[PDB]
């Protein structure tokens, strides 16, 4: 579970930075947009997500205009794990 | 915004586990061993007493009863003002 939460973070900032990336802004741009700190963005950029959590990363998202939707199904009686998933639509 | 956001997210989530574990007709104390946490942490997830949970806890604990969790991102609507975080039981 430890394991399974640094990888959501991982992917939850992939799409972040992803998205900063398509958006063409400049470190200070993306700071004043997301609505943190020049310090946070810097981290943010380097994949330091220590000071990020979970909800924090998805509200980023939300302030570059992505909605996140967290759908929660049984996992198939044909499958012995469930997972965290994170996709793009 | 900001704290608001969060509690709200983690209600639905919580919401969602209340549901799974309803219909799943699991005891408190076959929950707790299900989900390796103690029957008192079992007991504020019952009563919507979230202080102690973080939201990737939660979907966690959903994992361990079986739940898979799909996070999808998406550009928002044109006509709506704002994007959000939204919880879906499916």
């Given at each position: 579970?430890?394991?399974?939460?640094?990888?959501?973070?991982?992917?939850?900032?992939?799409?972040?930075?992803?998205?900063?990336?398509?958006?063409?802004?400049?470190?200070?741009?993306?700071?004043?947009?997301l609505g943190?700190?020049?310090?946070?963005?810097?981290?943010?950029?380097?994949?330091?997500?220590?000071?990020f959590s979970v909800e924090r990363l998805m509200t980023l998202l939300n302030a570059?205009?992505?909605?996140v939707?967290?759908?929660?199904?049984?996992?198939?009686?044909?499958?012995?794990?469930?997972?965290?998933?994170?996709?793009?639509?």
């Amino acid at each position: 579970p430890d394991a399974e939460e640094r990888q959501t973070k991982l992917r939850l900032a992939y799409a972040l930075n992803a998205v900063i990336d398509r958006a063409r802004l400049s470190q200070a741009a993306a700071a004043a947009r997301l609505g943190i700190n020049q310090p946070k963005v810097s981290a943010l950029r380097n994949y330091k997500l220590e000071g990020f959590s979970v909800e924090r990363l998805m509200t980023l998202l939300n302030a570059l205009d992505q909605d996140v939707e967290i759908v929660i199904r049984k996992k198939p009686r044909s499958r012995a794990a469930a997972r965290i998933s994170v996709v793009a639509a």
